Amino acid sequence: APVLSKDVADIESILALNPRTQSHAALHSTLAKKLDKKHWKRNPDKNCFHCEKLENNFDDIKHTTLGERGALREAMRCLKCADAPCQKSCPTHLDIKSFITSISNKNYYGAAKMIFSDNPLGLTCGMVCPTSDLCVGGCNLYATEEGSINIGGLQQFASEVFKAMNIPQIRNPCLPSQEKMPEAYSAKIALLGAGPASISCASFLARLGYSDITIFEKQEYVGGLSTSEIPQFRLPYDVVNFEIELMKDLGVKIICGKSLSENEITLNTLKEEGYKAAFIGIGLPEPKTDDIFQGLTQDQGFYTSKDFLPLVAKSSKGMCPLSIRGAVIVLGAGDTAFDCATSALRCGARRVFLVFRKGFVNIRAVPEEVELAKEEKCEFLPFLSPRKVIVKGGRIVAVQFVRTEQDETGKWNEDEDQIVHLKADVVISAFGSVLRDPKVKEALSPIKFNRWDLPEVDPETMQTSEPWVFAGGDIVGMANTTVESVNDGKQASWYIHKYIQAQYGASVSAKPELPLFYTPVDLVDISVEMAGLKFINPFGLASAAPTTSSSMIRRAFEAGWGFALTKTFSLDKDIVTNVSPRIVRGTTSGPMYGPGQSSFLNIELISEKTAAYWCQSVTELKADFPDNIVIASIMCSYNKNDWMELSRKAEASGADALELNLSSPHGMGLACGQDPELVRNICRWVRQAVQIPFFAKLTPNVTDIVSIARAAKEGGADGVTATNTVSGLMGLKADGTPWPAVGAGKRTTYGGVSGTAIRPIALRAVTTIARALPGFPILATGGIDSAESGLQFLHSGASVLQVCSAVQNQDFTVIQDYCTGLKALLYLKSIEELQGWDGQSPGTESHQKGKPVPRIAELMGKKLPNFGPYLEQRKKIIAEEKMRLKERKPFIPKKPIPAIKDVIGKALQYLGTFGELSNIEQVVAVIDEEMCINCGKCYMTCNDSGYQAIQFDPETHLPTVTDTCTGCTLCLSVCPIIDCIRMVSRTTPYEPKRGL
């Protein structure tokens, strides 16, 4: 034996970058720092002017793109505000609060479905909306140092997961069968142009039940500007495809090759052919051009943006050569100019100047869009109106501008004495767009147009001066964004509907009502029976502060809850007075304030309201809500008369069941629920007093919750509720006083912990009563705050699920997220192609900044982290590879969808004793270097809490697990990147780690 408690020098050497307690101030010269600094540089460089080659690079450049880890953190962050201003600031009124709520709960289907109900192009809009002049500009968290939520990145992600699940849209299932629809619904509707505006309008019309809807498009491709000009590196063409496949799911017909124009389609022909309504969504087809450019061609290198963008599109997109070398001048200050500037780099420009008429603060493009130009090392020339495109040699070679300025009233002039000669090869008119075409205008004869030569519409109804013809989108000249065009189709859709019905003799609601968005997921059954009660869904308010009053129970039933407990009430004699404060927040996960508290503590007593109030309540609630279960929670002292007098009273007022609150003192713990013989007897009393089911509610503050459960079963209870709160003390202030602190003496008493902090306790309770009394109905409670969690508890043996803290953290409306949540989890289970996901979470792509990190037998296993000079090299392998390189059918369930009753107790078979655990099938951890952000947490935690088995490279900060791994699994557990360390099977000799 040598010195067992000193590390032999191999491990002395693996430990070399571990943290050590620091005892002097370090010594490093400014010159050495200046040199070291470049080795770890993550970012953008201002000692760098030629960033990478961009040419033929159409990969995603949005900064708001989120992967799953990222999207889960941002959604948790959001406050989920009442009457949210984000949604006030959204042109299409998306319920962001709900959809953000659902993301936080891993319900991507319910988020996506909320998103698409109010915007049928929610993905597109996720990607391109200028959120900072819309929803994000209104977010309450801008009032904090960390700032607004990335709402669009969240909208983007949920819809992207919903893309991947491959679920069709369906007809409004509320609606009658098709052959039973009134006749008005078969009127022919024509929409002109397949852009966001008509796609939106026909979707809503399809949703209302219209069966003969046709989109007539000029071009061969669909989607309007999102296809032909929004770049592929901000809006992938296949996002656009998928949103149109959704619309086509509802029966909308598209016909390409037929234009609104003289001797093609006109209003008058639309009339003779029997169309009843026409929606005009043709956009602004023509380029706002300057006279000085008259005569130049593409051969001399002149393009309008309507020449240029569609060409680059046709080349980087299944939509239908690129070649812009040298110095490029881009004229204009809107979105159009900024997208030419950046697609220029993609056909290989050496330099891109953007030149503005007016100045910097007059930039109209989407400040996100101005970002991409800045970081690509575009040049910005303010205050210069064009005058002369000098040509020589067949090719443009410069351009002569005049200076402009404004004379402290606010109007502009030009100084002829001052010109710039501006060497260039390509000039791109990027001013904007108009409707000029007279054969188009003729085709709308006779509607009125205004000054601007746009169709005039009433802006509330979208109707033109002909009442069968409507218009929306860019062509009306008010909307500048995709989400505003969509909202134009939305608004039009309802008044087209009012107009068509009236022509057939019928009238429509007074309050506009368009339908939500639907999928087959929504038809999934999620009722369950337990103790011979039918629950319309398995979620319920527990007996607790959300049921302080019976009008709140009323409001919760109308929001959709399946059942509720009354707050526990007692005979009169037994009535109690609360103290205040008595509900405080948990400290169970550090100093996070606001949404998502991991527990609360309460020292709250039973109801201050009387048995009379509560019985009369129960009767009013069961009269108006016959299919909602109402359980009456009651409490007495250890007293046979009381327990019989109170359970008969509750029963006769019409409760579906009782809950015995077993937290009363005795006179084997001090509360009744801590002693089996007392619980046995109480159950015997109640069982002989009433005929309805009753459940005993167990306390987890016991050595063996199984022997209280059984006692209840032996005493005749029809089930148990597991569990009530854990006894605890939530913490002390640094001078010693507690919180909650009552009176001027700052007194406290022990309280009950609730929330997700206690979920492991409750789950293990539920699991262990189910293995031991299998068959005996359990109602779970303790930290249920999504559908995924409820499902854990159902899997564990519970039949219905009681909720308290998740509603204190939010409001009765989570119920909508729990339902669509559970319908989604059960439906995915019938989808073969999606067997690799965990519930709604896809199999994880290898990501940094939640984007896919490439695959080339160079970058795979020659150690290149994403920083410093290695980064510089991955970006040269990736931008000489883009040099070199120059079917949608919905899944179908194949197994019927399971009911709740088919998933209850499924997990029970995987539990067991410790010696049913294989000690033969050992694992090692394994780190995916493409997924690693170089933190060294796996390393610090294997060193001071593990087996010193990870090498951490001092020059790359890449870790590597050695053959010493014992599969403890700590490293996986602390790693911030989801699915970066995987546990795999040991493949070489492990004997245990014995010491001498």
Q: Which member of 87, 385, 429, 724 binds ligand FMN (CB under 6 A)?
A: 724
Contact set for ligand FMN, span 701-720 (CB under 6 A)? none
Distance, first Cα to last Cα, the chain: 7
Nearer to ligand FMN, 66 or 634 (CB): 634
Residues 341 and 308 sit within 8 Å (Cβ to Cβ): no
Please state the three-class secondary structure of 538-581 as a single string: CEEECCCHHHCCHHHHHHHHHHCCCEEECCCEECHHHCCCCCCC
Residues 6 or more apart whose Cβ sits within 8 Å of residue 505: none
Residue 530, binding choice from ligand FMN, ligand SF4, its own copies, none, Cβ under 5 to 8 Å by partner class = none
- Separation CA 86–CA 685 (nearest Å): 55
Are 125 and 92 a contacting pair, CB within 8 Å? yes
Q: Which of 754, 840, 943, 948 binds ligand FMN (CB under 6 A)?
A: 754
- Residue given tokens 């086509």 in the structure block: 248
Decide if residue 547 touches ligand SF4 (CB under 6 A): no
Window 573-632: residues binding ligand FMN (CB under 6 A): 583, 600, 602, 604, 606
Task: Provide the minimum distance between the beta carbon of 825 and ligand SF4 in the complex, in angstroms, as a whole number.
Answer: 25
DSSP-derived 3-state class of residue 283: coil
Query: Which does residue 872 touch among its own copies, ligand FMN, ligand SF4, none (CB within 5 to 8 A, set by kind)?
Result: none
Residue selected from 149, 344, 878, 942 as contacting ligand SF4 according to rule CB under 6 A: 942
Instruction: List binders of ligand FMN among 510-569 (CB under 6 A).
Output: 542-545, 567-568
Residues 910/916/921/922 CA torsion (nearest 10 deg) = 90
Among 466, 462, 454, 449, which residue's Cα sits nearest to residue 197? 462
Residues in the chain: 996
- Taking the C-alpha atoms of residue 498 and residue 45, their distance in angstroms, rounded to an integer, is 58
- The answer for residues whose C-beta is within 8 angstroms of residue 265's C-beta and 6 or more apart is 190, 192, 216, 258, 259, 443
Binding flag, residue 868, ligand SF4 (CB under 6 A): no
Q: The tokens of 392 are what?
A: 């020589």
Breaks (C-N over 2.5 A) in the chain follow: 317, 320, 322, 667, 886
- One-character DSSP codes across 713-724: HHTT-S-EEE--
CB of 861 to its own copies, least distance (A): 20
DSSP state letter for 698: P
| Binding site partner of 825, from ligand SF4, its own copies, ligand FMN, none, Cβ cut-off 5-8 A by kind | its own copies
Roughly what angle, to the nearest 10 degrees, separates helices 705-714 and 759-772? 50
Residue 179, SS3 per DSSP: helix
Nearer to ligand FMN, 215 or 765 (CB): 765
In terms of Cα–Cα distance, which of 376, 389, 327, 334 is closest to 353? 327
The two three-digit tokens of residue 639, written as one number? 């007293």
Q: In the complex, what is the shortest distance from the CB of residue 819 to ligand SF4, in angstroms, rounded to a whole number? A: 23
Q: How far apart are CA 335 and CA 338, in angstroms?
A: 5
User: If contact means CB under 5 to 8 A according to the sort of partner, which of ligand FMN, its own copies, ligand SF4, none does residue 950 touch?
Assistant: ligand SF4
Give the residue with the Cβ less far from ligand SF4, 92 or 148. Answer: 92
- Minimum CB separation of residue 547 from ligand FMN in Å reads 8
Query: Are 165 and 888 contacting, i.e. CB atoms less than 8 angstroms apart?
Result: no
Which of 455, 437, 433, 435 has its CA nearest to residue 446?
455
737 binds, among its own copies, ligand FMN, ligand SF4, none (CB under 5 to 8 A by kind): its own copies
In the complex, minimum distance from the CB of residue 103 to its own copies, in angstroms, rounded to a whole number: 10
Q: How far is the CB of 77 from ligand FMN (least distance, A)?
A: 22
| Residue among 673 and 865 whose Cβ is closer to ligand FMN | 673
Nearest by Cα to 141 from 171, 194, 100: 100
Query: Residue 96 binds which one of ligand SF4, its own copies, ligand FMN, none, with CB within 5 to 8 A depending on kind?
Result: ligand SF4
Contact of residue 31 among ligand FMN, ligand SF4, its own copies, none (CB under 5-8 Å per partner type): its own copies
| x/- letters, 793..832, toward ligand FMN (CB under 6 A) | ----------xxxx--------------------------
* String marking each residue 123-162 x if it binds ligand SF4 according to CB under 6 A: --xx--x-x--xx---------------xx--x-------
516 binds, among its own copies, ligand SF4, ligand FMN, none (CB under 5 to 8 A by kind): its own copies
Nearer Cβ to ligand SF4 (483/553): 483
Quote the tokens at residue 963.
């053959």
Burial of 370 (0-12, 13-18, 19+ CB in 10 A): buried
661 makes contact, choosing from ligand FMN, ligand SF4, its own copies, none, with CB < 5 to 8 Å by partner type, with: ligand FMN
Nearer to ligand FMN, 115 or 542 (CB): 542
Location of structure tokens 């061969």: 220
- Map tokens 């007692």 to a residue: 570
Question: Segment near ligand SF4 (CB under 6 A), from 57-65, 245-253, 604-612, 961-969?
Answer: 961-969
Distance CA 657, CA 680 (A): 18
Please confirm whether the linkage preceding 992 is cis (ω < 30° from 0). Answer: no
Residue 62 or residue 697: which is nearer to ligand FMN going by CB? 697
Name which position in 94, 330, 457, 722 contacts ligand SF4 (CB under 6 A). Answer: 94
| Of positions 946, 952, 975, 977, contacts ligand SF4 by CB under 6 A | 946
Pairing of strands 569-570, 253-256: unpaired
Please choose which of ligand FMN, its own copies, ligand SF4, none residue 151 contacts, taking the beta carbon within 5 to 8 angstroms, the exact cut-off set by kind.
Answer: ligand SF4
Whichever of 183 and 417 has its CB closer to its own copies, that residue is 417
Question: Binding string to ligand FMN for residues 646 to 665, with x set by CB under 6 A, is what?
Answer: ---------------x----
Measured CA to CA, the distance from residue 81 to residue 100 in angstroms comes to 10
Interface mask (CB under 6 A) for ligand FMN, residues 684-703, using x and -?
-------------x------
Q: Interface with ligand FMN by CB under 6 A: which residues?
A: 542-545, 567-568, 583, 600, 602, 604, 606, 633, 661, 697, 724-725, 754-755, 781-784, 803-806
Q: Interface with ligand SF4 by CB under 6 A: which residues?
A: 90, 92, 94, 96, 119, 125-126, 129, 131, 134-135, 151-152, 155, 483, 925, 941-942, 946-947, 949-950, 961, 965-971
